[PDB]
């Protein structure tokens, strides 16, 4: 059964863990428990194909930034997450992108830009600004909410589709 | 930082995932989503020492039995879980222990016998009988409930102490 190694990356607090847990447990976690490194395996059906998703939920805290090199070498696709109510998290996206491109030594790494917390009314990042950044990278952009589940399945399925295109 | 590699093993349905999620997230999962393989890295203080617990939540489905060798080699201590309302799960304990002993090529591997679902009134395994089994193995026995949190911290901390007391 085809396996896809997906890695969720982004600034500390954007909702990487909440997105992953919502996808896998169908449960929204309101608590903030900073992650070191957690991994999940889930069997799903995407476009009629049964897939195994190997999801790595990474640390946004810079304390654990030395762990990035190994997960970027093995990761097949990257979910690059920012929060729509956190200007700094959007600015931190390009750093994750640049690091992934450098480790992979490639410009066409499967990625999806995710603008999380779209359920909140405190927006500080314009959807247009995010769409434009995704165009400069030539990657899809999807807005999500780990709380309401808006766009969650779409963000992970799209990333799997990006890996399939690249194979 | 001292790291402890803990592996949660047992028959399908005993509550391995519910115990792990209760330990880490302090809530009880009513849903039954069979596990393939999930991992968690969590920082905790045990006996005044800051520890890193690497917890592997394994598959109880007998279909994934070929995956056991690798996690038994890597694992330092094993939480051997049965459910007090499932006699097959209690008898399956012997098979998990014999497999661990064989991979490790040792008779004294850190283990803790856990009798989960102790909140339920449908008991089929007497506490005395579980206690006698743990005594024959020379390991600690604790009854737990992933629902009420009874014995959960004690089961994981005791296993860390077994790894520590073995070193
Ligand atoms: N309203 C709302 N809150 C969210 C959403 N996603 C995550 N959160 C909240 O933001 C906080 C951080 O979520 P978390 O999943 O821990 O973020 P993280 O990026 O994994 C944190 P770390 O990098 O340290 O592991 C939590 O309080 C969580 O409930 C969302 O889509 N909507
Ligand atoms: N009453 C009660 N129910 C529990 C307890 N622990 C787990 N359960 C329940 O048993 C079912 C299976 O729990 P789960 O944690 O998935 O068990 P598992 O051993 O991980 C199953 P698998 O081996 O396939 O991964 C769920 O309905 C869950 O709510 C408990 O301590 N008490
Ligand atoms: C016991 N496994 C549990 C799964 C694992 C955490 C991790 N899976 C790997 O195969 C692997 C191999 C080398 C380095 C990193 C990894 C991880 C990885 C990266 C990207 C996406 C998923 C994911 N799964 C590794 C440890
Ligand atoms: Mg996290
Ligand atoms: Mg499980």
Residue numbers in the entry:
A (entry chain B), B (entry chain A): 1 to 167
Give sentences copied directly from the paper behind this entry.
KRAS is the most frequently mutated oncogene and belongs to the protein family of small GTPases that function as binary molecular switches involved in cell signaling. Although KRAS could serve as an excellent target for many cancers, no therapeutic agent directly targeting RAS has been clinically approved. The shallow, polar pocket situated between the switch I and switch II region of KRAS (SI/II‐pocket) is of particular interest because it is present in the active, oncogenic form of KRAS.
The complementary “kinked” docking pose of 12 b in the SI/II‐pocket of KRAS encouraged us to generate a sub‐library of 1383 rotenoid‐like “kinked” molecules with contiguous fused rings from our corporate database for a second virtual screening campaign. To ensure that the shape complementarity between the rigid three‐dimensional topology of our “kinked” library and the KRAS protein were assessed accurately, we developed a “snugness‐of‐fit” scoring function. The “kinked” library was virtually screened in an analogous procedure to that used for the vDNP, with the addition of the “snugness of fit” scoring function for pose post‐processing. After visual inspection, 7 compounds were selected for NMR testing and the racemic compound 15 showed NMR cross peak shifts. Both enantiomers 15 R and 15 S docked with conserved indole binding modes; hence, the racemate 15 was separated into its two enantiomers 15 R (2R,3S) and 15 S (2S,3R). Enantiomer 15 R was successfully soaked into the crystallography system with the crystal structure confirming the docking pose. 15 R binds to the SI/II‐pocket of active KRAS and forms two chelating H‐bonds to D54 with an N−O distance of 2.9 and 3.0 Å, respectively, and a weaker third H‐bond to the K9 side chain through the carbonyl group with an O−N distance of 3.4 Å.
